[PDB]
Structures are given as structure tokens and as C-alpha cells.
Write a protein that binds this ligand. Sequence first.
Ligand SMILES: Nc1ncnc2c1ncn2[C@@H]1O[C@H](COP(=O)(O)OP(=O)(O)O)[C@@H](O)[C@H]1O
Ligand SMILES: Nc1ncnc2c1ncn2[C@@H]1O[C@H](COP(=O)(O)OP(=O)(O)O)[C@@H](O)[C@H]1O
Ligand SMILES: Nc1ncnc2c1ncn2[C@@H]1O[C@H](COP(=O)(O)OP(=O)(O)O)[C@@H](O)[C@H]1O
Lengths: 723, 474
Amino acid sequence: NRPNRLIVDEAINEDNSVVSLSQPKMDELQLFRGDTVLLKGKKRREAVCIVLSDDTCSDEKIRMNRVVRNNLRVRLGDVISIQPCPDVKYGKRIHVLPIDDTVEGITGNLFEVYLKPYFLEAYRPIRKGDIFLVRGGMRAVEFKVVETDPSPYCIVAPDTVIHCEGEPIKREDEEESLNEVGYDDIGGCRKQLAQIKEMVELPLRHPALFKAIGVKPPRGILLYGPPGTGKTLIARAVANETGAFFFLINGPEIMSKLAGESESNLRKAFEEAEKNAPAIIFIDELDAIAPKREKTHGEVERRIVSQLLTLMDGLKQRAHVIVMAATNRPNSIDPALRRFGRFDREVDIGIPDATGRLEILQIHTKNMKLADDVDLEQVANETHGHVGADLAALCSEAALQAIRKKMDLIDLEDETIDAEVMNSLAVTMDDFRWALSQSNPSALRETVVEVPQVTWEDIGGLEDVKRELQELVQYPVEHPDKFLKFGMTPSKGVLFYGPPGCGKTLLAKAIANECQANFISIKGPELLTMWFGESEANVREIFDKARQAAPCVLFFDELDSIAKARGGNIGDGGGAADRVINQILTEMDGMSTKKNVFIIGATNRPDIIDPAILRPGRLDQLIYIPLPDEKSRVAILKANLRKSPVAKDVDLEFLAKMTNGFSGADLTEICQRACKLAIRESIESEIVPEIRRDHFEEAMRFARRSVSDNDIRKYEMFAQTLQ
Amino acid sequence: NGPEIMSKLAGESESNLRKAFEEAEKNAPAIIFIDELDAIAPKREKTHGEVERRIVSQLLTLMDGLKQRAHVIVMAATNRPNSIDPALRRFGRFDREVDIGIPDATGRLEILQIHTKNMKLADDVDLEQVANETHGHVGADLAALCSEAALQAIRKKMDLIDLEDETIDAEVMNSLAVTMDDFRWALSQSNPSALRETVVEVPQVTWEDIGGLEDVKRELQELVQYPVEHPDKFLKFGMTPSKGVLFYGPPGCGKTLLAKAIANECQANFISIKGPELLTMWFGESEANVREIFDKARQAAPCVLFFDELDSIAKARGGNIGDGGGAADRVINQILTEMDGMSTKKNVFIIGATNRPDIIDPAILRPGRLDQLIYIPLPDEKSRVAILKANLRKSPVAKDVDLEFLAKMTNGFSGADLTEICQRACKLAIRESIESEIVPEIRRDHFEEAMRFARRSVSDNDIRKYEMFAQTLQ
Ligand SMILES: Nc1ncnc2c1ncn2[C@@H]1O[C@H](COP(=O)(O)OP(=O)(O)O)[C@@H](O)[C@H]1O
Ligand SMILES: Nc1ncnc2c1ncn2[C@@H]1O[C@H](COP(=O)(O)OP(=O)(O)O)[C@@H](O)[C@H]1O
Ligand SMILES: Nc1ncnc2c1ncn2[C@@H]1O[C@H](COP(=O)(O)OP(=O)(O)O)[C@@H](O)[C@H]1O
């Protein structure tokens, strides 16, 4: 069906003039590492770009940022017609003009601030009619190629002349502003966007299909997540990216309207969103309107909720829309809205993780001139509990800082600041430092899902166990066909045990990174927090946010905590079971054996655990993790000094023979102690830095042995029957 | 619809109902079906407000309002008894009740055949297979399943082929097929997210899964089979049938497989109240739920209300040592009230199991409650041979593998133990076929290597414990 017709998918190379294709695809069309291509799309338009090779690209697709996509008048998924074009010769004269609605405010030399560094020996293959976008000066300006000498298209060579009639052009109707929202404006939310897409794909892109297929398209999508996540943002970008109409409904907006006029706006809204369908009616603060819980008091209040349920179902189905909504949590809303037929589909958008926050920052700085010393990653790595918005405001209070110094002290009072100036202004890693430093980091923080930021390189020794872990998790998911071959059902989870500080936790994380799964750590104190408050009900809440994030490894640290608390050794008249541990057994048993959630329980006190968690069907496998041996010790030091100023003369294999009854934790202690000397040095001389030998040998002075030989044996006798 | 009428302005509400009934009497015979009943008539503590109150009354006057002359039937629906308002139960309105719990094995299967009876299913598609893995799935959860299962087989076939039209062709859709592989993806989604509540079902196991213990098997039928399939005789002599049994003995000997298998025999429902749930009530001081149970069991007869780890509450509170108090406790007590209350003449048989007879409240052994005490000892040389076969029935048993042999290798083992040794052989076999590729039939060198990590759950001390307990207990 013509191997010159592809499906436009998002891009990996953000450059305005690039369209990536797989290496095997470029061989079927016969194009090299730079062949200028001529792209053809709907609304009878064309564009010229540079083809490249992308491995992550399937032969069935062509990556292209939004500028490209827009100029063709296509949306992700459509069909376009590529074509080599080795006849485009260097242009002569190029007339480009800014668009009034992307300059209101800046003045001066546009040709110097934007245009110039843009084509600066870029040899960009533009066309007559294109609309490229240039960033810089804490903003983005859109230019429309009015006339190119080698019309219609030519390559921009350091010779080609460039005009700027300094008279901004109005925005043409069918020209969506590249200023609006799109998937390129959402960071860290991958798994989520994935789901949401295939959901609205067919219905919002291919209406007709349903005019003939007897299949019902999910009507309602509900978006979870705490305030800031960016539930709304996503919902809008979904519509702008599918061309679908978008009607926003704010919560207090409708609950502010006089009693009676309220049922009016909703009915009125829906009705009007059906008129421009396809569409996404996106309710903002759903819970402010529909929380029909114990909290349901009053006539107005009740009737309002009903008004919706009659409209949620009210979707004549004939109608062609999708109702997206958002809330702070399941319990906020009213159960009636979950009824299979309204908000049947749910998507959680928890806080951002390591890579997330980093991905976000690159989005909110993609317009300002960042300084060399600026370490974007650095920031992402210190903002443990930061939502999307908390990061945005961060860059704002971080740039406003680099402003109250540069052009502010220089001070350029005007009715409109110059653009050359703003492009010269730079924000330094030092300005961001000040941002965090403010009380702005006040980004709420709750239970955290993520990905393990550690590998097996951080785990010294214990190789025999490493592979064993993969035998319980790697095989059951990457070879499920075999597990049926024999019939036996995979173990539900493991239980690490042994002395404290031997990597029982590093293992639980590292194995999850291996399987690229989410990590969920329920630490001892949280088990106790529930235990003391008699709120073991929360346990259920956990297993859900785990199931709502498969693949995952629900991990329980200090599983013995509740026992030690209640006494442990002596204890009381009672026995092994207790309220929190019990609930986790109901959920661990309940939890569908056929899901993708693996439980790992760790304890440095196997001798007090409720023997019910070791029953088959729950935590079958019992794995013992002993202190480090002569070998492991050598690798542990290296693993805990990897990212440190290790002097050359320093002997590691040596210390491995100095210590014996040590655990990873102990060795680690001796390490920092060497560093607490090194920093005590460099800070002393100034008022020269590479941690050396005389440091460690002096750090052996205060060398301990967390694991006492008595206990040493304890685990030998426990790991007798336990084994 | 419920919110339909509770959405209408105050006043216009009493209008629609009256208006509705009136119009349903005009075309009679008819069924006036109220959807979300509970959202209009839950007149409970939650009864706050004028409009709210008056609306409920408006109905009661219309429920009775059925001139009887009129010729209609008012069907209604709700999530549970406690949701509604008691006034609606008055003998004359909603006097008849029907429960439609979740679907069971055969159910889900029957359903799927209904929502695929229109699409071209692939050969590899195993409809049953699905029904067997959707433990907690309602009707709708299964329907959407086929939708997200067909939409998947679509975003590949004619979608990648792309046939953009104001209307797709029919030859095409008839060629399109949904594969067992597309369904796999469905379940795989977060869609299974149905519900999971107090589960009633039928025993998916027979006596073929229970090795040895034949003497007991027939005994079970003597307590349940005779009293229902020959009730004419039980009156012949006068004696009243025992209300229930109490299995006991070491852990992992089939005390549970027996309780299930006997219910399959009588084709009855199975209801398993496991230890942790007894404790859940015990810790929350919510032993009130106990009553809720015995009901969903009387509203499901025939049935076997089975209580596992009935000893749980005892061990918890201490058991051996314990505290200043006695054998009774709040949860166990409530079950005695309900077990005594529960009409002797119904069709609900109680089975209580415990691997610790020595701590049970001796009141449950009183006549009228759990009279019969049956001891289930570990497996003998014979039983062991049959257990292996029973636990390897659906497995890649090599030919050269000797079963009668292992039966002489193990002694102090219980069904559970033998079972452990089994999977261990398999955890080697799968560790094999997975290692070569990167050929599959479980052989002998596997088991003999699986005897390495062979245990003995039942220790000889305890062994004797049940000998001395089963001395007076018998
Ligand atoms: N994941 C994200 N990617 C890019 N920007 C984000 C993200 N999360 C939050 N933001 C920023 O913070 C604001 C939060 O927006 P919004 O959609 O209204 O969130 P919420 O639904 O929690 O109220 C956005 O306008 C956006 O600029
Ligand atoms: N096997 C190991 N290899 C490298 N470092 C280790 C190892 N075991 C422990 N450590 C060090 O000691 C600390 C103890 O970590 P953790 O696994 O959480 O202890 P545990 O689980 O035994 O309570 C680690 O953060 C790490 O820096
Ligand atoms: N008599 C038996 N025949 C076949 N398998 C058995 C037998 N007894 C125990 N098993 C195996 O061990 C498990 C123990 O089951 P169960 O009846 O629940 O033990 P118990 O009630 O004594 O605690 C079974 O699911 C089964 O796999």
C-alpha cells in the first residue's frame, strides 16, 4: 500500500526540521544520513525536512515534532507521503515575519535574537508558507516564511539573505498556535499517557467506525492524583492533540451559581459540547460537586449530583463525546459515579519520580537561557516530594531571582522591554539554589511510588542470591508459558532475613529495577503508625495503589516491628498474630494471584514473625542474607566508594582482612568517617582534596561491629529450622 | 431511574412518580422498574430533610397505591437490604425478594458465550479458560472485557490496515478475528477491577482430589447425604439430624478439601469464613458481622458454612498460656447464637476445622451445634501413594518416575508436605526448559533432588499430641 505512506508519531528529535525514520525503512526508500525530504499531508500542504535514523522508531511510523505536524495539518496517527528531494538548491532571499500574538511585549532586533542563531549554519530546508518556532529570551516567537527566492522551497545556507519587514502578521484561522498545549508539554507521565491514548484514539479520531461497529467506547475517564500532578493539563493536551473540542467545567464554578441556575449550566454545558463533538468535557474539581458521601446534606447539594448522573448516562451514546474528570482520591467522590457506564475507567497520576522531575524541568526551562553551571538533573535529585506545579513555580522563582539582579539592577524601564536584553539574561545554578532555599518546596508529600534508582552494581557479593531472585520474578513473567506447562503456580512473594545492614533492602530495590517495575516501601514505623492508631484499615488502601501500578514490588521493611513493639521476646498473654499483620494477610491472600504484584518482606528478627506469613500462598520462599565474607567485603567497599575521591595508595583488600563481623552498614560507617576527616581537612587548610590512606587507618579507631557473635549464632540456629 | 427523579426540582419530583405510575397503569399489564431505588428511598438514619422525606412517602402511598384493580408489578433494585427503607418491606409492597449474587465458574463462562456470540473468535480462544481466571467478576466486568478484548484485535487488524470510511465494509469485519492473545491483553489491563466480596460458589473439587481417607468420605455423606435425600426416614425414628461437624488433626491433611468435596457431592454452595476474617472481626470488635454471614448462607441453601482455623481467635488471645479469662470470646460466642438460632429445619450445614482442638471453646461441641468430631490423621503408606497421584494429576509426570517408592521414603508427612516436594520438582523442570532454549517433561532426577529440601511439617511431639487429644476428644 505504498511504502512511502507513514503514520505520524511523536518525535525524539525536537528539531523543527527533522523527521526520524528507522534504519530499515530508509533502505526501502533509499535515503541517507541527510537526504532532504518533501513531506505531503492533508489540507493539501507540504513541508521540507531532514531525514534521520531512529532505532526506537517502527517501520510503520515517522517521528515529527508539532511544528512539522501542524504545518502539514495532521494529528498523531494520520497518513502522510514522504519523498526524497535532492533538487532543492541553496536559497537566495527569505522573507519571514513574526506573528503579533507571540511578540506583544518584546522589541528590537528579532533577526539577531532569534533568526540568526537559528539558521546559523544549519542549512535548514524551509518552505513558502511554513511556520517555524524559535525559543529564547524567556519566551517563544512564531515566524511564517512569506517568500523564498528559490520558491517554493530552498535550503538556508550562510549566504542566503534574510528579511524581517518588522511588521507582525495576524494569525490565520486554520493555524493552531504552537503556543498551546500538547504531549510535548507533559513530563514524567508515560505509562499514563499510554493508557489514556488508546482509550480516546478510535472514538475521537475515527467516529464513523462506531457508526458501524457494535462496540461501546469507554464514555468516562477519571483522573486521580493529588493537587499539582497536572490532571487538567493532560486532559487539555489530549483534546488539542486530537483536534477534539474541549469544554472545561470548574467545580466551584457550578457550585457558585445560584440554586437552579446550577442545573442550568451543566445541562447547558453538555448540550453545547454535543454540538461541536468530537469533544472532551473535562470536569475540574469533581469532588466539589459530586461527593455524595456522609457529607451529603441539603437539597441543593443532593439534586446537583443527581443532575450529573442523569447527564453522565445522559450521553445519548448517539452523542459523540468523552467526559474526563479529576479528583484528589477515590474516597472524595460519590460511588454512584463508578457505575459501569459512567466513570468506569480510572487512571492514577501519582507524584513524579527521579527521571520525572528531571523531564519536567527541561520543559519549563526550554525557553530561558540556562547557565553552564546549571545542573538540571542535580535539582530533580533533591526535590524528593515535588509535584508538577511545585517544579514550575520553582523555575519562575528561580528566573525572577536571576532577574532582580541582571536587567533589574541595570534596570530597563519601558512600556516594553527589549528582546536583545532578555536573550542576554542568563539564569545560573546559583539562582536555582536560592529557589529551593525558599519556603517554596512546600509541595505536599504522601506515600511514594517510583522506580529503583539502584542496580546490582551497588550490591557487594551475594551473587548466588541475585540470580535466585530472578528465578522467582524474572521467570514467572518473562516465560509464563512454561509455568503452565507443568501446572505449578508461581510463588506470591519472598521474605529476606538476617542481620541488619546486609542489603536486604538494596536487594528488594535492585530486583525491581531489573524488571523495570515500581517500588513501594512500607517501612516499619508506618506499620506501627497504623498499629497505634488502630487504623489497620489503611492496609487495604496500600495493596490497591500497588495493584494500580503493576508491575510492582510491594516491600515491607521491619515486618517484625509490630512484634518488637508489643514486646517481642517477653510480649504479653497473647500470641503471634496482631491487627496490622492480620490485615496484610487478608490482602495478600485476596490479591489476585494472576496480577503483576510481587511481595517482599524483610526482617532482622525472623524469630518473632507471625508464622502465618510463611504459609504457602503468601511468603513461601525464605532467603537468608548473612554478613559479608572476605570477598563480599572487598566489593562492598568499592560499591560504597564508587562515587567518591578514592586515593590510589588506599588499600581495600586489606581492610577486608581487618574486618570480619561487619555488615554492609558497618563498612559504610567506616567509610563516611574517613570522609568526615577529609572535609574536616579541605575546610581547615583554606581557612588539596582527595581522600587518602592516613584517613581510613585513623577511621579504624572508632570501628564497631553491629553484629555481635551471640546474635551471629542466633541466625545460625534460626536459619537451621528456618532453612 | 433513581437520580433521575431525585434530580427533578422539589415538587416536580412527586409529579413524575405519580405521573409515571398513572401512565404505567394505562398500558398494563406492566412492570414499573425503579433503577437506583436506594437513592430515593433509603429512609434510614440518613433520612434528613423535607424533600428527602416527602419523596419516600410519595412512593409508599403509590406502592400501596396500586389499586390492585390496576394490573402492574413494581420491580426494584438495590445494592443491599440495609440501603433501603424498612417501610418498603411491609407485607403488601416489596414482600418478595430475590438475590443475584456474583457469577460462579459456569456462570462467567455462560456469560462470555453471550458477549462473543457476534464476533469471529479464533481457534486458540479458550472461553472457559477466561471464566476460570476471573474469580471476582460481575456481569458488566465481563462484557467490557470482550469489548477491550475485541478493540485490541482491532487496533491491529483493520486499523493498521486502515479502512477510513463514513462506513466500514462488512466483508472486512467478518474477516477480522479476535485471538486468545487479544483477551490475554484484556485481563492484563486494570479492567478486571470489578469487586470482591463475601464469595458464595459451588465446590470446584471432587473426591478424586482427596487421597486416602475413604472411611471418612462415606461418613460425611452419612451426615449430609442421608438427612436430605431420605428425610422421610429421619422422621421414622424421631431423632433429629446433627447440625454440623468439626474436622481436626494436623495441618495440611485435607480437612478443607473434604469440606469442599462433600459440598460438590451434594451440589451445594460453599462459604469459607477463614481464620483471618474471624480475627478481623475480633480486632475491630465487629462480631456483629457474624449475623450478616449466617443470612447470606440461609439465602443460598443448600450450603456448607465452613469455618477454617476456628482456633485462630484462641491462639491470638494467647491459647496455651492466654490471660485471666476463659475459653469463650466475642466472635465465637456470636456464632453460637446464630448456629443455635438458625432453623434446624433449613438446608445449611456447618463444618468447623481446627489444627488445635485443644483450645476451642467446649461450647461448640455441645449437642445441637457441632456434635460430630472427626479426626483426620496424617497420610498412611497407601494414602501417600494416592495423594501424589492426586496432586500430579494435571502435571507432566514422566514414566520412569516411581510414586509407590516415595510413599516409603516419607512417613511423618501430610498432604501439604508431599505437595511441597512436588512443586520443588517442578521448580526444577521450569528452571530447565527455560535454561536450554536461552524437551519439557518432569522426570526422576528431579524428585530425587527435591528430596534434598524435604521437610516434615508434623513433628512427632505434636504427632502424639493429637493421639492424646483424640483420646478423650474421641
Ligand atoms: N507533569 C507535568 N508536566 C509539565 N507541567 C506540569 C506537570 N504537572 C504540573 N505541571 C504544571 O503545573 C500546573 C498544574 O496544572 P493542572 O493541570 O491544573 O494540575 P491539577 O490538575 O493538579 O490542578 C500546569 O499548568 C503545568 O504548567
Ligand atoms: N551487599 C552490600 N553491598 C554494598 N553495600 C551494602 C551491602 N549491604 C549493605 N550495604 C550498605 O549498608 C546500607 C544498609 O542497607 P540496607 O539494605 O537497607 O540494610 P538492611 O536491609 O540489612 O536493613 C546500604 O545503604 C549500603 O550503603
Ligand atoms: N488428603 C489429601 N489428598 C490430596 N491432597 C491433600 C490432602 N491433604 C492435603 N492435601 C494438599 O495439601 C493442601 C492442604 O489442604 P487443607 O485441606 O486445606 O489442609 P488442612 O485443612 O488440614 O489445614 C491441599 O490444598 C492439597 O494440595
